[PDB]
Write a protein that holds these residues in place. Structure first.
Motif, PDB file in Angstrom:
ATOM      1  N   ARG A  34       0.877  -1.211   0.000  1.00  0.00           N
ATOM      2  CA  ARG A  34       0.000   0.000   0.000  1.00  0.00           C
ATOM      3  C   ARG A  34       0.898   1.240   0.000  1.00  0.00           C
ATOM      4  O   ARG A  34       0.605   2.164  -0.751  1.00  0.00           O
ATOM      5  CB  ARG A  34      -0.927   0.076   1.218  1.00  0.00           C
ATOM      6  N   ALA A  35       1.979   1.211   0.786  1.00  0.00           N
ATOM      7  CA  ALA A  35       2.894   2.343   1.068  1.00  0.00           C
ATOM      8  C   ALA A  35       3.876   2.579  -0.079  1.00  0.00           C
ATOM      9  O   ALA A  35       4.294   3.752  -0.266  1.00  0.00           O
ATOM     10  CB  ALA A  35       3.659   2.048   2.327  1.00  0.00           C
ATOM     11  N   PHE A  36       4.280   1.489  -0.738  1.00  0.00           N
ATOM     12  CA  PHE A  36       5.433   1.423  -1.668  1.00  0.00           C
ATOM     13  C   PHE A  36       4.950   1.643  -3.095  1.00  0.00           C
ATOM     14  O   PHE A  36       5.652   2.324  -3.875  1.00  0.00           O
ATOM     15  CB  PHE A  36       6.138   0.067  -1.599  1.00  0.00           C
ATOM     16  N   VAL A  37       3.795   1.065  -3.417  1.00  0.00           N
ATOM     17  CA  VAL A  37       3.290   0.961  -4.815  1.00  0.00           C
ATOM     18  C   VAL A  37       2.038   1.820  -4.905  1.00  0.00           C
ATOM     19  O   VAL A  37       1.327   1.910  -3.916  1.00  0.00           O
ATOM     20  CB  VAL A  37       3.038  -0.505  -5.208  1.00  0.00           C
ATOM     21  N   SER A  38       1.813   2.447  -6.047  1.00  0.00           N
ATOM     22  CA  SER A  38       0.634   3.313  -6.296  1.00  0.00           C
ATOM     23  C   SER A  38      -0.591   2.426  -6.517  1.00  0.00           C
ATOM     24  O   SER A  38      -0.435   1.202  -6.666  1.00  0.00           O
ATOM     25  CB  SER A  38       0.868   4.205  -7.467  1.00  0.00           C
ATOM     26  N   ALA A  39      -1.767   3.033  -6.544  1.00  0.00           N
ATOM     27  CA  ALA A  39      -3.068   2.335  -6.494  1.00  0.00           C
ATOM     28  C   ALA A  39      -3.298   1.635  -7.828  1.00  0.00           C
ATOM     29  O   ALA A  39      -3.634   0.445  -7.823  1.00  0.00           O
ATOM     30  CB  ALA A  39      -4.141   3.332  -6.181  1.00  0.00           C
ATOM     31  N   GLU A  40      -3.088   2.375  -8.918  1.00  0.00           N
ATOM     32  CA  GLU A  40      -3.143   1.884 -10.316  1.00  0.00           C
ATOM     33  C   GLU A  40      -2.211   0.679 -10.447  1.00  0.00           C
ATOM     34  O   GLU A  40      -2.627  -0.337 -11.050  1.00  0.00           O
ATOM     35  CB  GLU A  40      -2.712   2.986 -11.289  1.00  0.00           C
ATOM     36  N   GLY A  41      -0.987   0.813  -9.930  1.00  0.00           N
ATOM     37  CA  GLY A  41       0.083  -0.191 -10.069  1.00  0.00           C
ATOM     38  C   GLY A  41      -0.224  -1.400  -9.220  1.00  0.00           C
ATOM     39  O   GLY A  41       0.280  -2.486  -9.519  1.00  0.00           O
ATOM     40  N   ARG A  42      -1.041  -1.207  -8.192  1.00  0.00           N
ATOM     41  CA  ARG A  42      -1.433  -2.280  -7.250  1.00  0.00           C
ATOM     42  C   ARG A  42      -2.575  -3.114  -7.833  1.00  0.00           C
ATOM     43  O   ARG A  42      -2.527  -4.346  -7.654  1.00  0.00           O
ATOM     44  CB  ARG A  42      -1.799  -1.676  -5.896  1.00  0.00           C
ATOM     45  N   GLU A  43      -3.545  -2.486  -8.498  1.00  0.00           N
ATOM     46  CA  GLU A  43      -4.602  -3.198  -9.273  1.00  0.00           C
ATOM     47  C   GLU A  43      -3.944  -4.068 -10.354  1.00  0.00           C
ATOM     48  O   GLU A  43      -4.207  -5.293 -10.425  1.00  0.00           O
ATOM     49  CB  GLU A  43      -5.567  -2.199  -9.908  1.00  0.00           C
ATOM     50  N   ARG A  44      -3.105  -3.441 -11.162  1.00  0.00           N
ATOM     51  CA  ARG A  44      -2.390  -4.098 -12.274  1.00  0.00           C
ATOM     52  C   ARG A  44      -1.757  -5.385 -11.757  1.00  0.00           C
ATOM     53  O   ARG A  44      -1.847  -6.405 -12.440  1.00  0.00           O
ATOM     54  CB  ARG A  44      -1.341  -3.147 -12.851  1.00  0.00           C
ATOM     55  N   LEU A  45      -1.131  -5.342 -10.591  1.00  0.00           N
ATOM     56  CA  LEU A  45      -0.350  -6.493 -10.069  1.00  0.00           C
ATOM     57  C   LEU A  45      -1.298  -7.641  -9.713  1.00  0.00           C
ATOM     58  O   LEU A  45      -0.911  -8.809  -9.909  1.00  0.00           O
ATOM     59  CB  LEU A  45       0.431  -6.036  -8.837  1.00  0.00           C
ATOM     60  N   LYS A  46      -2.466  -7.315  -9.152  1.00  0.00           N
ATOM     61  CA  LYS A  46      -3.480  -8.311  -8.727  1.00  0.00           C
ATOM     62  C   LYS A  46      -4.196  -8.788  -9.989  1.00  0.00           C
ATOM     63  O   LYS A  46      -4.402 -10.006 -10.136  1.00  0.00           O
ATOM     64  CB  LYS A  46      -4.398  -7.706  -7.661  1.00  0.00           C
ATOM     65  N   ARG A  47      -4.470  -7.868 -10.908  1.00  0.00           N
ATOM     66  CA  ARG A  47      -5.068  -8.191 -12.227  1.00  0.00           C
ATOM     67  C   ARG A  47      -4.249  -9.270 -12.945  1.00  0.00           C
ATOM     68  O   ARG A  47      -4.871 -10.153 -13.536  1.00  0.00           O
ATOM     69  CB  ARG A  47      -5.130  -6.939 -13.098  1.00  0.00           C
ATOM     70  N   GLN A  73      12.511   4.437  -5.490  1.00  0.00           N
ATOM     71  CA  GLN A  73      11.860   5.597  -4.847  1.00  0.00           C
ATOM     72  C   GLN A  73      10.377   5.287  -4.774  1.00  0.00           C
ATOM     73  O   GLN A  73       9.694   5.263  -5.793  1.00  0.00           O
ATOM     74  CB  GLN A  73      12.149   6.864  -5.660  1.00  0.00           C
ATOM     75  N   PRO A  74       9.818   5.074  -3.567  1.00  0.00           N
ATOM     76  CA  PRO A  74       8.378   4.938  -3.412  1.00  0.00           C
ATOM     77  C   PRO A  74       7.717   6.302  -3.507  1.00  0.00           C
ATOM     78  O   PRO A  74       8.351   7.306  -3.219  1.00  0.00           O
ATOM     79  CB  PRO A  74       8.212   4.350  -2.017  1.00  0.00           C
ATOM     80  N   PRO A  75       6.431   6.389  -3.911  1.00  0.00           N
ATOM     81  CA  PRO A  75       5.638   5.232  -4.300  1.00  0.00           C
ATOM     82  C   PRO A  75       5.903   4.923  -5.776  1.00  0.00           C
ATOM     83  O   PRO A  75       6.111   5.830  -6.568  1.00  0.00           O
ATOM     84  CB  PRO A  75       4.214   5.720  -4.073  1.00  0.00           C
ATOM     85  N   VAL A  76       5.904   3.637  -6.095  1.00  0.00           N
ATOM     86  CA  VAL A  76       6.335   3.100  -7.410  1.00  0.00           C
ATOM     87  C   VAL A  76       5.133   3.198  -8.348  1.00  0.00           C
ATOM     88  O   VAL A  76       4.045   2.685  -7.990  1.00  0.00           O
ATOM     89  CB  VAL A  76       6.851   1.666  -7.197  1.00  0.00           C
ATOM     90  N   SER A  77       5.326   3.862  -9.494  1.00  0.00           N
ATOM     91  CA  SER A  77       4.299   4.203 -10.518  1.00  0.00           C
ATOM     92  C   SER A  77       3.801   2.942 -11.226  1.00  0.00           C
ATOM     93  O   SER A  77       4.605   2.022 -11.345  1.00  0.00           O
ATOM     94  CB  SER A  77       4.906   5.144 -11.517  1.00  0.00           C
ATOM     95  N   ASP A  78       2.564   2.934 -11.746  1.00  0.00           N
ATOM     96  CA  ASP A  78       2.020   1.876 -12.653  1.00  0.00           C
ATOM     97  C   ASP A  78       2.996   1.628 -13.811  1.00  0.00           C
ATOM     98  O   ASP A  78       3.217   0.468 -14.178  1.00  0.00           O
ATOM     99  CB  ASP A  78       0.655   2.283 -13.212  1.00  0.00           C
TER     100      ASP A  78
END
Length: 99
Positions: A34-47, A73-78
């Motif tokens: 949640r802290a390291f990766v962006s929201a878009e990039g976090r959906e993509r990973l689960k997708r 460098q966090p947060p990591v972009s999609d």
């Protein structure tokens, strides 16, 4: 007869200590991302996890070790996630080429 009331009281504890520790690392991981990766990039990973869990998991491992050590460098972009998902896919295939 074979095992004590106390000793059985310990193996239900041991065993329930572990279902706790398991849950606490699944939560620690979810927080670290949640802290390291962006929201878009976090959906993509689960997708992508649905189709190729191992791939999406290889990135999450890398992002965590990398951010925790200050190498990313966090947060990591999609955009950086998408880049990493290609690089692992690519290296999965380059392994499977027997090279």
């Amino acid at each position: 007869v074979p095992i004590s009331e106390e000793q059985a009281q310990q193996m239900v504890a041991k065993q329930q200590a572990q279902q706790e520790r398991m849950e606490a690392l699944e939560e620690q991981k979810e927080n670290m991302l949640r802290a390291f990766v962006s929201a878009e990039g976090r959906e993509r990973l689960k997708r992508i996890a649905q189709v190729k869990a191992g791939r999406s998991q290889a990135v999450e491992m890398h992002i965590i070790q990398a951010v925790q050590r200050g190498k990313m460098q966090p947060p990591v972009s999609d955009d950086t996630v998408r880049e990493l998902l290609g690089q692992m896919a690519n290296q999965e295939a380059e392994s499977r080429s027997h090279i």
